[PDB]
Design a binder for this molecule. Structure first.
Ligand SMILES: C=CC1=C(C)[C@@H](Cc2[nH]c(/C=C3N=C(/C=C4\NC(=O)[C@H](C)[C@H]4CC)C(C)=C\3CCC(=O)O)c(CCC(=O)O)c2C)NC1=O
Ligand SMILES: C=CC1=C(C)[C@@H](Cc2[nH]c(/C=C3N=C(/C=C4\NC(=O)[C@H](C)[C@H]4CC)C(C)=C\3CCC(=O)O)c(CCC(=O)O)c2C)NC1=O
Ligand SMILES: C=CC1=C(C)[C@@H](Cc2[nH]c(/C=C3N=C(/C=C4\NC(=O)[C@H](C)[C@H]4CC)C(C)=C\3CCC(=O)O)c(CCC(=O)O)c2C)NC1=O
Ligand SMILES: C=CC1=C(C)[C@@H](Cc2[nH]c(/C=C3N=C(/C=C4\NC(=O)[C@H](C)[C@H]4CC)C(C)=C\3CCC(=O)O)c(CCC(=O)O)c2C)NC1=O
Ligand SMILES: C=CC1=C(C)[C@@H](Cc2[nH]c(/C=C3N=C(/C=C4\NC(=O)[C@H](C)[C@H]4CC)C(C)=C\3CCC(=O)O)c(CCC(=O)O)c2C)NC1=O
Ligand SMILES: C=CC1=C(C)[C@@H](Cc2[nH]c(/C=C3N=C(/C=C4\NC(=O)[C@H](C)[C@H]4CC)C(C)=C\3CCC(=O)O)c(CCC(=O)O)c2C)NC1=O
Ligand SMILES: C=CC1=C(C)[C@@H](Cc2[nH]c(/C=C3N=C(/C=C4\NC(=O)[C@H](C)[C@H]4CC)C(C)=C\3CCC(=O)O)c(CCC(=O)O)c2C)NC1=O
Ligand SMILES: C=CC1=C(C)[C@@H](Cc2[nH]c(/C=C3N=C(/C=C4\NC(=O)[C@H](C)[C@H]4CC)C(C)=C\3CCC(=O)O)c(CCC(=O)O)c2C)NC1=O
Ligand SMILES: C=CC1=C(C)[C@@H](Cc2[nH]c(/C=C3N=C(/C=C4\NC(=O)[C@H](C)[C@H]4CC)C(C)=C\3CCC(=O)O)c(CCC(=O)O)c2C)NC1=O
Ligand SMILES: C=CC1=C(C)[C@@H](Cc2[nH]c(/C=C3N=C(/C=C4\NC(=O)[C@H](C)[C@H]4CC)C(C)=C\3CCC(=O)O)c(CCC(=O)O)c2C)NC1=O
Ligand SMILES: CCC1=C(C)[C@@H](CC2=N/C(=C\c3[nH]c(C[C@@H]4NC(=O)C(C)=C4CC)c(C)c3CCC(=O)O)C(CCC(=O)O)=C2C)NC1=O
Lengths: 227, 162, 177, 172, 331, 172, 162
């Protein structure tokens, strides 16, 4: 049935054994139906899961799904099925899907469910075909039933960003929902670009004479205050 | 329920870890604030009644229409007054629980979750209770650190309803 | 419970046909091998408590942790139940030698036993060890090669039947593990 | 999951009342003795692996069954599972010693576990003897009059022996 | 075994042995043969103690009552009562476990059905609390039920599976939870060994369990416990729910599948032999590529609710992990 | 992530030394002033919603283009997104006020963000004006001499203004 | 780095919310132990040299084959002695860091992570360091709660290597 084409492969963080024995920090806490959490800890799993797929601002009272919650709290589904039926929910489709140019929705799916950046451009190509023909359904079926997702999340775990921050460093990687927000640099281009946004330029004003020039001492001021 | 203690044990449990020195320092710090917390908790319980009646009265004085509307939701009956004092009583109860526990866990568990759907389905404005809590925040009569322990939570509920 | 006859009848019943000549010929070989099966069952039934004695004494004397305090043979009552269980295992195996079919053993002794021994805390590897000792002991009695009792039988070959009895004991030993 | 406080608030709210003054006074006494609690938990954590392994030496020495072939202890992998299990139970006993109430020990570790040590054919009675090898060691380190203010700790050692007896009672 | 082979569903359910029946057919005292009586006596111990183990020492207990069955003193009704009153029967069934456990046993021993509704439990517990133990036992024996089914001359047998005694559909399923195999007795069965009540949530609420036929993959299993949600707070991650309400019922009917032996050593991820995380020995699944020491399956026996079009896939995955399937009932 | 402490110890270990006496003494002074820090963070959190909404009222009234059709506050969903972004930046300023060091605020929020409000066509200059509407309000609630004993907090208020100026400088 | 402080920030970050009173209680408890922590920290820095030398000497006296075994990995050269005192120097350094920070975060970051793979690839063993830490734990000379602050972390590293 035309399988996915053979693509390349890159080297990111998620494929090494970082020896964070007795791990100190940057491990998501873990949100799992395995620990038999009561009402609250259930609500914390539910909110975290919502943020992970919908992520932050998109999660809202209107989008919020009561019914999949009431099923999840009562044990009628697994968390994995909750994440799936989350993405199939249409409020996620009106925002994050109808906007995204097909190759870009592949980012937010391989990246909001698996917690890893895309290996190369070719990955975006192949997976965008299978979501272009089979529909969104079987694409999400591919990611979830994949060997990878079973290997690290199993049946009941909210997906996280794997290895975003190294043990001995602070920077690491930018947070995920930050990295692919939703709107695509070029999505607007086809429509009217945004307008009447000047006021913000109007409010912050600097005379040209005030602006620092090359070779003044003031330009390096910031460096001095960090030492 | 979210305490400081269950929070620290939950985190160290999720890291697959014993309680190290860090979490023990956290539990220490819970114990060395708990005395002011209980002084605050006893005076609120000690005069809870007058706080409730004065609160509902302040809500009535600020919003005169509530005692005048024909509709059932508004305290124009002999029922909405009792139910008005009922709800204000609930909030003052939860604040006393959170002063005993040491986090906002009891209010977040028993009270905060799902409250939008109640105030949306029963046409209950968020401000009414805001006004109530402002009177309680002004008239609890605590002093010093106990007053900070009370005003933290009483502000917190206002942050929930706003 | 089903003998050889009943297994031919049940297979021919799902086949929805009469037994016919072929099945009947193999069952004729069963009948002509009948008296060897009879004397074989007499060999396993005679000196069978002695088989259970040697088997369990070998199980404990090989593995001394059972009689150690805290073990599953450690109590006099527990040793009683131990001995009787060996006896009943050998009893249903003897029935499977008479019937020529494992239906009595599968329906009645084998089923529920893994969950019983696991449900008591009985070590299963030790039970399969004792079943193995009853296996080799039973085959050595069935072949007249017992070092203590070499009784008179007419001379012949019965390797088929020894493989059959070894199949039943291996069925029990695989059933507890 | 619930500590000593959230249980009292949970009961108090489930009845829908204020906490009474008498309840507050006893709760003040619990807060007023909490340093001892932290101390005990510190004296367990700081010896914890030694506790586990020494109780393992005792266990395998007294019951020589487990180690030999045909036993759970014999497999190299299963031997590590055995040691880990003891570590897990010690970890949760330490958690429920800090929280005050047997809540985290009764939902994350002990719950369903006797059902599980019968699906693996592991003698849960021997597991409860392993826990009885940890209780004596752990209390024996809890009652070390060393580095710490002298005084009365009996009311809290009684609170430590509860949890160890609960695990031993729940795997069997 | 197989329901289809031999044209009989019940025998292969494990209840094939229990057909044997034992009515004394000899009128008048048997002075010397001592053959029928020792068989009937043994069958009474097999029924009343349900295959529990009694020794020579323990044959000294109830030796008198035993010597009164052999005489024109007791019918087997009254002999069974005499065995039920004695020191042994109380040690095993009554002292070790709670009345609900004890009540349910007393029906397996005396009537051979299970209690169906809570009304049976209320009646017998109230007789107990008014009068104590011996009137509890009498209240089993002294009722229309025992007299009608056995008529005081027949050793008790299992009839709870049969359709002829009137019981609720659940009493059928409950019948098989209480009796597992010829081997399983009182101490031996995991569900009701000593103290634990065999039926609690199920016995009280008439929840039809399902049948796992004894033996094979599903022989060793026990259901995971559920709590009740926010009111009377309890953990919600323990098991799949019996009900499956809502919109999912799309994609075909929901199948409640029980998986029975889950284990580290057995769980492989589809590929034979145990996979090693580190080069040298570390075998649990890495969390965030950091070693964790947490079992991949936490407890042996998770359930799955799966709609029909996802069946095959689910059916594959269990067998990938080497979990073995107990029972699959459409919900 | 790094607090006040972990920065000093991270520098000292990155050079592989002990901590000299001078570093320890200044660190003692920071511990000796830490109650004031807690007080400020208490006075921000317990007024945080009011801060956000009042700065939003000020922002929209002053610069009306965002509220009207075409702008970014116009869509109701966009409007809510606008508000909670202000809540987010206030949240991380509160975190970095506790930790003492701009570490959590410089990796989880601010880093990457100016890139993001250029992929959405959102005026980040207007966002910096919103942060300038939150700084005023937050410091104006921080300097409330109420329920708290009198003293000197300029040395800490100034530090707090650093973070709000750093967010405004980093979204533009 | 795992502090109490970054632990609290991290937990309330993961819950998507403003720091509650709970976390501030935890930070309080770090500050009210920090003085004894620094008393402990200054004296270990104050005589770290003699602790190192005493420790390596004790390692040698307990294990006499080390000074006699012809090998790269053993202190029978003039190199393994200096490198022996180098590593002991590292442990004591990390303990003084953890006393300043107030959790085991510096030791868990800079020392504990991946140390088994070092002691597996280089023939390194826990016993040599275990013996060293026992000598340091016996001879640091701290008094009172500072000694408990030292012995907590010094025990903690022994729990790691065992
Ligand atoms: C656990 C926490 C908790 C609460 C905080 C309350 C909140 C709450 N209040 C009401 C319900 C109500 N609450 C009020 C109260 C009001 N009367 C007025 O004049 C004022 C605006 C206001 C008091 C300040 C009234 C009048 C009703 C009934 C409304 C109606 O039926 O019209 C209801 C719907 C159920 C009911 O009718 O009781 C709920 C959930 N209930 C809870 O379980
Ligand atoms: C129809 C077939 C049939 C069987 C095969 C047995 C199987 C069986 N054994 C026991 C029970 C027992 N079986 C043993 C036997 C053992 N002692 C050990 O040292 C060894 C591991 C092992 C012998 C090799 C013991 C000791 C008990 C009692 C266990 C106990 O009470 O602790 C029980 C529970 C009831 C009882 O106590 O008797 C059952 C069902 N019963 C049956 O009805
Ligand atoms: C009621 C009790 C009862 C028994 C105990 C048997 C005894 C028995 N065995 C055989 C007969 C026999 N028995 C054996 C048995 C064997 N020969 C060997 O060399 C092996 C050691 C051993 C394996 C079991 C053999 C080989 C025969 C002769 C072959 C045959 O008849 O099939 C016969 C045939 C008649 C005769 O030989 O005089 C009889 C009656 N039958 C019974 O009815
Ligand atoms: C979250 C909490 C949690 C626990 C407490 C454990 C409990 C636990 N232990 C085992 C499994 C095991 N546990 C042990 C341990 C034992 N070895 C013995 O000699 C002693 C009796 C005992 C240590 C005191 C052994 C040996 C196994 C493997 C059993 C086997 O495969 O035969 C299993 C099955 C999965 C596996 O094989 O790992 C589980 C769930 N797992 C968890 O997830
Ligand atoms: C952050 C970590 C942390 C700890 C580890 C504890 C340590 C600690 N323990 C006590 C104080 C004490 N600790 C104990 C403990 C006991 N005494 C005995 O003889 C028994 C052996 C043992 C049983 C547990 C006792 C009895 C006191 C004094 C009584 C009391 O203060 O309640 C004190 C009071 C102050 C002082 O004594 O100087 C402190 C701070 N608190 C903390 O904040
Ligand atoms: C109070 C309500 C009540 C019922 C509804 C029945 C339900 C019921 N049916 C059977 C049992 C049975 N029921 C049937 C019926 C069937 N034959 C077929 O060809 C069809 C599929 C189906 C009729 C539509 C058969 C054949 C058996 C015997 C099955 C067997 O032994 O193989 C049994 C087991 C006991 C027995 O053998 O009788 C029970 C409980 N009994 C009750 O007490
Ligand atoms: C698809 C359809 C569908 C439904 C119809 C519901 C049905 C339903 N309700 C609850 C759960 C609940 N339902 C109610 C409702 C009640 N409160 C009362 O005072 C009344 C008796 C009753 C409203 C008339 C309550 C209170 C709970 C929580 C019960 C508890 O936790 O104690 C649960 C368990 C999961 C949960 O906690 O949400 C389920 C499955 N869920 C679904 O998915
Ligand atoms: C961890 C840190 C963190 C942040 C700082 C935010 C930053 C952020 N804001 C938005 C998204 C948004 N942010 C705003 C906010 C604005 N409305 C205006 O009128 C002003 C210019 C401005 C407030 C000052 C709006 C309106 C959107 C939605 C934009 C749109 O959909 O058109 C998005 C895309 C995802 C979403 O829609 O929520 C992101 C990543 N998110 C994060 O995770
Ligand atoms: C757990 C929560 C928690 C808090 C919220 C703080 C609250 C707090 N603040 C102070 C104490 C104080 N708090 C302030 C603060 C200030 N005074 C001013 O006039 C300015 C308006 C403001 C700037 C921030 C000052 C100046 C003191 C007294 C000086 C000092 O103790 O350093 C004290 C000392 C004890 C006392 O005064 O009774 C405490 C406990 N600490 C905590 O543990
Ligand atoms: C941050 C913490 C930190 C440590 C704790 C050390 C630990 C450490 N030691 C060595 C390496 C070494 N460590 C020792 C030390 C020993 N000599 C002996 O006789 C004794 C057994 C023992 C002192 C008690 C020796 C001899 C080597 C070199 C081994 C060799 O090359 O054969 C190495 C490999 C790199 C190297 O050669 O330096 C490392 C990582 N390094 C670190 O970065
Ligand atoms: C020191 C601890 C110890 C024991 C106890 C024995 C137990 C024992 N008996 C065996 C096997 C065995 N046992 C008997 C039964 C036995 N022999 C008879 O002739 C009579 C009358 C018997 C009962 C009184 C027989 C008949 C065999 C088969 C071997 C043979 O031909 O004798 C075997 C061999 C098992 C096998 O083949 O796998 C063992 C291990 N061995 C030990 O090491």
């Amino acid at each position: 049935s035309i399988p996915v084409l053979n693509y390349s492969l890159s080297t990111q963080n998620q494929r090494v054994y970082s020896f964070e024995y007795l791990p100190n920090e940057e491990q998501p806490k873990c949100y799992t139906t395995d620990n038999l959490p009561a009402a609250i800890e259930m609500d914390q799993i539910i909110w975290a899961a919502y943020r992970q797929i919908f992520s932050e601002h998109q999660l809202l009272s209107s989008t919020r799904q009561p019914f999949l919650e009431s099923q999840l709290r009562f044990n009628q589904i697994t968390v994995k099925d909750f994440i799936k039926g989350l993405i199939l929910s249409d409020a996620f489709r009106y925002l994050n899907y109808d906007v995204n140019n097909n190759y870009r929705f592949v980012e937010m799916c391989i990246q909001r469910i698996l917690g890893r950046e895309i290996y190369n451009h070719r990955e975006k190509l192949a997976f965008a075909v299978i979501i272009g023909s089979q529909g969104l359904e079987a694409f999400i079926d591919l990611l979830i039933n994949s060997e990878e997702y079973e290997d690290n999340f199993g049946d009941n775990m909210i997906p996280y960003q794997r290895r975003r921050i190294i043990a001995q460093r602070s920077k690491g990687e930018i947070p995920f929902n930050l990295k692919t927000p939703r709107l695509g640099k070029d999505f607007l281009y086809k429509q009217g670009m945004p307008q009447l946004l000047w006021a913000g330029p109007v409010h912050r004003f600097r005379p040209q004479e005030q602006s620092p020039k090359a070779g003044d001492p003031a330009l390096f001021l910031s460096m001095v205050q960090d030492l | 329920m979210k305490t400081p203690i269950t929070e620290a044990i939950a985190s160290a449990d999720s890291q697959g870890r014993f309680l190290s020195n860090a979490e023990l320092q956290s539990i220490t710090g819970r114990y060395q604030r708990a005395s002011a917390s209980l002084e605050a908790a006893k005076q609120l319980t000690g005069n809870a009644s007058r706080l409730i009646t004065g609160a509902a009265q302040a809500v009535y004085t600020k919003f005169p229409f509530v005692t005048q509307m024909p509709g059932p939701t508004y305290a124009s009956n002999a029922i909405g007054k009792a139910k008005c004092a009922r709800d204000i009583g609930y909030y003052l109860r939860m604040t006393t629980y959170c002063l005993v526990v040491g986090a906002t866990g009891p209010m977040d568990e028993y009270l905060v979750a799902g409250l939008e759907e109640i105030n949306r389905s029963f046409e209950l404005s968020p401000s009414w209770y805001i006004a109530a809590l402002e009177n309680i925040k002004n008239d609890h009569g605590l002093s010093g650190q106990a007053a900070n322990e009370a005003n933290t939570y009483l502000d917190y509920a206002i942050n929930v309803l706003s | 419970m089903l003998d050889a006859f009943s297994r031919v009848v049940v297979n021919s019943d799902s086949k929805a046909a009469y037994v016919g000549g072929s099945d009947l010929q193999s069952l004729k070989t069963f009948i002509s091998d009948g008296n060897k099966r009879l004397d074989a069952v007499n060999c396993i039934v005679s000196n069978a408590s002695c088989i259970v004695s040697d088997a369990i004494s070998g199980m404990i004397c090989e593995n001394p942790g059972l009689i150690a305090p805290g073990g599953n043979c450690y109590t006099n009552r527990r040793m009683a139940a131990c001995l009787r269980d060996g006896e009943i295992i050998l009893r249903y195996v003897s029935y499977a030698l008479l019937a020529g079919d494992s239906s009595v053993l599968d329906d009645r002794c084998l089923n529920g036993l893994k969950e019983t021994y696991i449900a008591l805390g009985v070590p299963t590897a030790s039970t399969s060890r004792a079943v193995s000792i009853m296996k080799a002991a039973s085959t050595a009695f069935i072949m007249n090669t017992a070092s203590g009792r070499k009784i008179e039988i007419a001379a012949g070959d019965c390797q088929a039947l020894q493989s059959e009895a070894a199949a039943y004991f291996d069925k029990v030993g695989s059933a507890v593990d | 999951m619930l500590d000593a406080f959230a249980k009292v608030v949970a009961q108090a709210d489930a009845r829908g009342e204020f906490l009474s003054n008498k309840q507050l006074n006893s709760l003040e006494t619990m807060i007023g003795e909490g340093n001892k609690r932290l101390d005990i938990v510190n004296k367990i954590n700081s010896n914890a692996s030694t506790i586990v392994t020494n109780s393992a030496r005792a266990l395998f020495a007294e019951q020589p069954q487990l180690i030999q072939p045909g036993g759970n202890a014999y497999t190299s992998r299963r031997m590590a599972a055995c040691l880990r299990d003891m570590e897990i139970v010690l970890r949760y006993v330490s958690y429920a010693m800090t929280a005050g109430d047997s809540s985290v020990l009764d939902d994350r570790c002990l719950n369903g576990l006797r059902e599980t040590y019968q699906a693996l054919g592991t003698p849960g009675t021997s597991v409860a003897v392993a826990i009885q090898k940890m209780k004596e060691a752990s209390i024996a380190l809890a009652n070390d009059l060393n580095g710490v203010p002298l005084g009365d700790c009996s009311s809290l050692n009684s609170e430590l022996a509860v949890y160890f007896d609960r695990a031993a009672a729940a795997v069997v | 075994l197989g329901t289809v082979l031999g044209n009989s569903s019940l025998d292969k359910l494990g209840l094939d042995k229990f057909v044997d029946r034992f009515e004394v057919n000899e009128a008048g005292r048997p002075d010397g043969f001592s053959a029928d009586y020792e068989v009937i006596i043994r069958a009474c111990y097999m029924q009343i103690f349900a295959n529990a183990y009694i020794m020579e020492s323990e044959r000294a207990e109830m030796a008198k009552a035993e010597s009164e069955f052999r005489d024109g003193r007791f019918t087997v009704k009254e002999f069974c009562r005499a065995l039920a009153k004695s020191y042994q029967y109380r040690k095993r069934f009554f002292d070790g476990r709670p009345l609900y456990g004890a009540i349910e046993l007393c029906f397996k021993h005396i009537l051979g059905r299970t209690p169906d509704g809570l009304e049976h439990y209320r009646a017998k517990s109230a007789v107990y609390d008014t009068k104590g133990y011996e009137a509890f036992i009498d209240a089993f024996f002294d009722d229309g039920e025992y007299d009608a089914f056995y008529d005081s001359y027949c050793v008790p047998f299992y009839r709870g599976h049969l359709t002829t005694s009137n019981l609720s559909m659940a009493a059928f399923t409950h019948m098989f939870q209480v009796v597992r195999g010829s081997s399983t007795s009182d101490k031996a069965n995991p569900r009701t060994m000593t103290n634990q009540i065999t039926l609690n949530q199920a016995g009280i609420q008439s929840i039809p369990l399902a049948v796992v036929a004894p033996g094979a993959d599903g022989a060793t299993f026990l259901a995971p416990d559920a709590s009740a949600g926010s009111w009377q707070t309890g953990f919600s991650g323990a098991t799949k729910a019996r009900t499956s309400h809502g919109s999912r019922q799309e994609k075909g009917k929901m199948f409640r599948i029980e998986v029975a032996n889950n284990t580290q050593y057995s769980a492989v991820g589809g590929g034979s032999g145990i996979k090693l995380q580190s080069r040298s020995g570390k075998f649990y699944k890495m969390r965030n590529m950091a070693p964790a020491k947490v079992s991949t399956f936490r407890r042996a026996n998770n359930v799955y609710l799966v709609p029909f079009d996802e069946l095959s896939a689910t059916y594959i995955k269990i067998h990938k992990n080497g979990g073995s399937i107990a029972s699959i009932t459409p919900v």
